[PDB]
Structures are given as structure tokens and as C-alpha cells.
Amino acid sequence: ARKLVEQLKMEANIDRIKVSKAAADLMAYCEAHAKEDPLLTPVPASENPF
Amino acid sequence: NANFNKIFLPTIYSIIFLTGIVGNGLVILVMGYQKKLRSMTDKYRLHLSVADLLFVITLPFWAVDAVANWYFGNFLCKAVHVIYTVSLYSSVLILAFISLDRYLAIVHATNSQRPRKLLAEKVVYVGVWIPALLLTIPDFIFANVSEADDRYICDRFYPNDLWVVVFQFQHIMVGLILPGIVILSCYCIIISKLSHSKGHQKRKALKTTVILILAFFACWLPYYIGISIDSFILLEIIKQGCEFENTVHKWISITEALAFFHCCLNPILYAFLGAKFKTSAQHALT
Amino acid sequence: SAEDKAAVERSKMIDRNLREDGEKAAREVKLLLLGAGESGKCTIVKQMTGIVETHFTFKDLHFKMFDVTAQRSERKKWIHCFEGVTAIIFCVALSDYDLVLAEDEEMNRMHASMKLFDSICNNKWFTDTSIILFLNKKDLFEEKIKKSPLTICYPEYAGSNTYEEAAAYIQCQFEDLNKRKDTKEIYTHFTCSTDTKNVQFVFDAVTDVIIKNNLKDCGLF
Amino acid sequence: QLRQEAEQLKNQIRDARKACADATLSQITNNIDPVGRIQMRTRRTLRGHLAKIYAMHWGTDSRLLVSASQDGKLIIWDSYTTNKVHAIPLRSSWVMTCAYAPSGNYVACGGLDNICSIYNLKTREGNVRVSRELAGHTGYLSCCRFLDDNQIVTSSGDTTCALWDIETGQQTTTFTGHTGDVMSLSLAPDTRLFVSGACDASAKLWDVREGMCRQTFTGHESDINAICFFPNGNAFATGSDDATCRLFDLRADQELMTYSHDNIICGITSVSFSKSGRLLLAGYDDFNCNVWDALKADRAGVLAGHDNRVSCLGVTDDGMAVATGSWDSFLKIWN
Ligand SMILES: c1cc(CN2CCCNCCNCCCNCC2)ccc1CN1CCCNCCNCCCNCC1
Ligand SMILES: CC(C)CCC[C@@H](C)[C@H]1CC[C@H]2[C@@H]3CC=C4C[C@@H](O)CC[C@]4(C)[C@H]3CC[C@]12C
């Protein structure tokens, strides 16, 4: 079981960030690109291929 | 006594009309709203439902005539007679074709997939709708409205009794003997192969097959008998008084009113009994 | 706009080809082979990389046979792919009651066979799918049962040490595991040395299954 | 002796994960305006399959897609005009996945035959021919994706993943470490990392070039059936058989949000995101598809047009439409 211990040691020595920062980044990405989303905002039939 | 006719026939006609229109509308709605492919037995259901639909929609004119005699014109009676004849013959021919298809599917289970498809896709059209349209020529030629006393009545008017006799014989021959023989033979061959079986699924089908045969003859056998006797009266080989003629007329009228029930019984038997159709209807409803 | 017309014509042609292929494929019979620790693939394969397909033709009927004994993954993750096969052929080694698994000596081999048969039969996917049971190795079983009584597998057995009685008891025990008695059937046959009855028995079972399916399709029941 | 060290390492990892948990997503996403109820109506109904449909994949031009069925057919459609462009007959009819090359020249397929077949579309003679066959996996193929015209990554049922080389037909890298069968796979937008969700109720992050696992995420109770990256490549979403969806973040290395309802008891067969990453499309076994809210964890729409279990789901690159394919043998496009 030396491989499991080595993998755990390799995956345990990393630096994480706060959950709030990641959530804020996700929210900012969602807000920034909300304009270009045909599913969120309905597109008029003039520019609707289907 | 016209009281019996006036109070008895229109009510039965209206009830049959309502039940048949409801059943056939439901069958058409279920068949049309089917996403998957159409099997070899759904086409037969569609044909039968269409024929019963025409036979149902030709009823209100007869009901009105029973209430108040014909005053709708001359062309409309011709159209009504043509539609009635077409539906009446097409229904029984479709029933015979269904029986033949079921015989092919059951007896020849493994080596009968092309004959059934060819039979449906070509022979159904030809042998069901060409003989049915070719038999409406007398309706076009002879069905005319005539005034008798203070009343107007429309029906086939033949030059003499020979035409009446030969056309009644043709009606009997095309309406009972041919589809009757086909249905009886196919379903009696099917029954004999399912009688000795032990499985559950081979005991329900038998219980559903022996019914169908009855539902044919118990609807049609008496009526033609009433005609079969009547023609013998026209041939001057049966000799009794006017009481016999009156009771023959009453029997024919009553038994024809009884026989008009096929257009509403067929949706119950050929569509609503099967579990596959019920499952399809449940999906179609939701 | 000839390009659009050419595209529509090509689409119609390939749609017609697909319809023809489907109509041809709907005429074939498909059987799925299951087994036991012996994998149940000895007699049937010879009488005629993961899944092995075997094709043959008997009496103007095309049979395809799928062997999945090389699929040692989770059975739950791919057993729904076979929902809709005509039948499942299950092999049981008769001369295997008084044996134990090499991996686990505590568990009986025939007990494992019964457990797997029960698991397969009562699966939610295989509700209307019939099972054809083949009991292999009957001569060795007959020669062995006289010396070794049939009590190490069935402690409740009470009968004469005769091949016929024990075979009937085993068949009854295997057929008793079925729960959906009104939707599926189990056909039992003792495999013989001659290669003229096994394929005939499979043909008869498939014909009966086809008749029962046509009863439902035609709307008779 | 090693068990104590492993337990200590796991406890340290859990303590570090709990230390970074400052505030939950729902605590700080409460101020944004919730999205309105989404009502999508079907536009096209692609038909022509005669059996269950097990996979689909949009092209990079957002017009052509490919669908794989159990009747031994791989059909390349034209979503705009409903015309079928190609219909390739497969050698084995037990197929569980399909893929469409980013360049549009090749397609890929696989299943219970343990072999990934790459077919060539843009041929001089106009006839599609098997370009290559890839073998070496000891379990059934569940997912396969194209890095480019010469590299393909597959995940197999033998608890392994593989990075191949189409020109030589030989395995280049092997990723091992999963306990249960791997059921899904999703590539990062930059094609530098990917994720794998297996039946051991855990997901792993793999590096293509390095060939070693970097992070492991857990929190599910049953087998994971689908996975998909966030559009920005810093998070992903997983769906399992216990009727729930979860959002994991690579940087925070812990779960962020969970999506579940008391009226849902069947698992998820496929998940997908939107162009902006605000909606989380999911396909359920109860014949229905659900549109979630990736930020507020509130349902915002039900797509119900299939009579059987939905097996595959996809969203175009530009987000113009969403395609769903079920065991009903009908694809449906919603806009
Ligand atoms: C047929 C035959 C007979 C027997 N005779 C007359 C036949 C002539 N030949 C004389 C030989 N016998 C003379 C005296 C003894 N028989 C009584 C009359 C009686 C009635 C019918 C049925 N038609 C069918 C016309 C088509 N419309 C169908 C629906 N219509 C509903 C209205 C009620 N049904 C009457 C209509
Ligand atoms: C006034 C009279 C002559 C009308 C006759 C109409 C008959 C011939 C028409 C009416 C509706 C038609 C059906 C409509 C749809 C289908 C489905 C197709 O997959 C097979 C043929 C089938 C089942 C048609 C057969 C012919 C049909 C029954």
C-alpha cells in the first residue's frame, strides 16, 4: 500500500483558496457572459435558425 | 301502429350514433397521436374506424326520416345511400381481411412477414374499396325520392320484381356468405391450435376469439334471415296471409335496428380489449 | 438550388436503405447465453473480444447467439442493452452439485448456479423474456450419483437414488425459482450427445415464443 | 503501519478542506436576481432510428450532429434541415458512446466490443471507410473524446483511462487509480486536463501530459453517470444514480453546491451546462429533463417530450439549441 500513501502525500501538499473567492469568481463569470446566452434570453425569430 | 316506430327507432338510432361517434373518435385520436411506427394491425384499425365513422354519420338522416319523412331533396338521398352502402360493405370486408391476417400471423408465425405486408399494402385497398365502390352503381341509378299520398319517401325503385330479387340475393351474398366463411374458417383454425395449450396467455386469446365469431353472427345472422324469408315471399313460393307479411316487416325492421350496433361494438372489441392499445392510449393521454 | 435537391434525394435514398435494413433485421432471432462458473459455453458453441457473436441458420431461420462470459465488469451497467432479446439460454452442470468453488470452498457450486439463475430470472429488464434451460453433463451425473448420495446439496431431499427421480427433483427446484408465472415461461431440456435435438428444441421454443408474441401484437389478448 | 499513515493523511486533507470553507455559495449568492421560468419548445424531431439511442455529439459548427443507436447505426444528421447527411453501419450493434472530431473529418464509436473505431468522413471517393481500430482495453468503453485529429482519450469499464495515438494505433498513456467502473469523461476547454467519474462514487482530475492524478473529489453515495466542465474550466458538475447533482471546484478542492428535490428518486443519465454557465441541464430516468440554476440551486424548467428514459444530452458551442436523445428512438432539439 506504498503507492496509495505516495499518492496521498502528493495530492495533500497543495495550496487551496477560500470558498468565497471561488464562488465570487464563478458568479462574476456568469454575470459577465450573461449577455451572450441564447438560452437565458430568448432570441427573436429573425435570428433563430430553428 | 306508428307509435311503436316513432318512439322506438329514433331513440335507438340516436344512442347508436352517440356511442359510435365517441368510440371511433377516440380510436382515430389514439391512432393518429402515435409517435412510433405503425404495425400491421393498426392500419386495419384505421380502416375499420373510418368505415364505422361513415356508417355512424349516415345515421341522423335515417333517424330524422323515422321522426319526420324525407324532405331533404333528391341528391342528398343518393349521397346518403352511397355512403351507407360503402361503409356497410367495407366494414365486413375489413373484418374478413383482419381475420385472414391474424390466421397468417398465428399459424405461420416465422415464415409469414412479407405476405402479410404485401396483403395489407395492396390487397386491402384493392379488394376492400374497389368492390365496395363498384356496388354503389345501383344507388346512383335507382335511389330516387318519390311522393306517395301526402308523404315523400326515397329508396331504390326497381323496374320490376326480378331486379329486386337479384339485388337482394347479391346483398346477401356479398354481406354474409363471403366474409362469414372467411372469418369462420380462419378463427376456427386458430381456435383448434390454442385449445390444448396450457399457458395463461393462450387461454385469454381463446376467450377473446370465440367471442368475436359470435359478435359477428349474433349481429348479422338474424337480419339477413329476415331478408332471406322476405325474398322467398317475393318469389311466390311462400303462401300465407297479410299477417305473415306484416310480422316479417316488423322482424326485419327490429333486427336491422339491432344489427346497426356493429359500428359501436367494433371499437370495443377490435381496439379496446387489447392491452397494447390500452397502453398506447395511456401514453397518448399524457 | 440543385444542391438542396441533391441533399434531399440522398437523404431519401439513405432513409429507404435504413428502412430496408430494419425490415431485414426484424426477421432474425437473437438469443443471449448465460452460464455459471463453467461459463456454460461448451456444448452450444460447438454444436452451432468482449462479446462473441455466433450466427447460424436452421429451417430457413437466422439465429444469432451472444456470449458475454468475457465481460467481467459490473453486470448492472450493461444488462439493459440486451432488453428485447428473443430468449436467454441458461446452462446448468448437473454433475456439479458435490463440488465447491476454488475461490471460496464454503459456497456450493450448484447453490451459486441457483442464485445466479434467480437473479437473472427476476430482473426488472427480463420480465417478458423467456428462458431455455439446458442441463448439461447427464451421463457423468448418472454415473456419479450412485456412489455419492444427493444430500450434500439438498438436505431436504427424500427419495430413491435414481437418476430419473433426482433429475426431476433438480428440474423442479430450478423451475420453482420463477416468480412471474403469468408473463414468462421456462423450457427445460436434458442435452443429448446427438446434435439433432438441441437445435430442434431451441427452434421449437423460439417458435412458441414468437407465437405468444404475435398473440399480443395482433391484439388478441 | 501504512494504514495509520493513510488515515493521518486523509484526516489532514479533511482538516485542510474544512479550514478553507469560509462561507457557502448560497450564503453569498442570495442577492442576485433569480432567473425567470424557462419555457423551451421543441423545434425539430429527428427520426430514423429503430432502437434505443445511447449517445450523441454536436459538431463544432453547431449544425451537424452524430447519434449512435443499438440497431448498429451511427447517423450524422443536419439539424437545420432535418436531412440525414450520413448513415454508417457499425460492425457491432452494442455501442455505448460516440464522438465527433473538432475538425469534422472523423467520427468515433465504441461499446461492448472493447474496440474504439475511428471512421473517416471527408474521403475523396465520397464513401465512409473505417480509418482505424483501437484495441487494448479489457473493459467496455463508456466514453471517448477527441483532443485533435491524431489524439483520442477513452475511458473503459476496467477502471482505467487511456490516451491513444491514431496514426500508430498504440496506447500512449494509461491513467489508473479508480476502483469502480469509469462511466464518464469530460475534457477541459484548453485540452490540458480532464476529469473522470467512476462507480466508486468519486471523481478524479487527470493531467494529459503528466499522466498522473492531481485531485480527488468525493461526496456521492452511488455510481456517477455523467460529468461536465464549467465553461471557464475552473469547476465541474457531476450526476449520480442517487438522484442528485453536485458542483465541485478545482481551486477550492471541495463541494460547492448540491441540486436535489424530494419528488425525484431516479438517477441522472447525463448533465450539461450552458454557454454562460448559468443553467445546468440534466437528464433523468423519469422520461424528463430538468433545467437547474447553477448559482441558486432552484429548478427553472422541465423539458418533457420523451416517452422513455433520456440517455444523452448536448448543447451547441454557441448555445443556440439543446439536443436530447432518449430510448424512444427520437432526438429532439429545443430552443
Ligand atoms: C328491407 C326489406 C323489407 C321487406 N319488404 C320490402 C322489400 C320489397 N319487396 C317486397 C316483398 N315483400 C313485401 C311485403 C313483406 N315484406 C315487407 C317489406 C323491409 C325493410 C327493409 C329495409 N330497408 C333498406 C333500405 C336502405 N336503407 C337502410 C336504412 N333504412 C332504415 C329505415 C328502416 N328500414 C327500411 C329500409
Ligand atoms: C370516401 C371513401 C372512398 C374514403 C376512403 C378513404 C380510405 C381509402 C383512406 C382514408 C384514410 C386512409 C389511411 C390514412 C393513413 C394511413 C397510414 C399509412 O401508413 C397506411 C395507409 C393508411 C392506413 C391509409 C389507408 C387509406 C385510408 C383508410
Side-chain angles (χ1 to χ4, degrees), chain B residues 38 43 46-47 125 129:
Chain B
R38 214 81 61 61
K43 310 192 196 127
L46 206 58
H47 282 243
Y125 293 111
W129 298 105

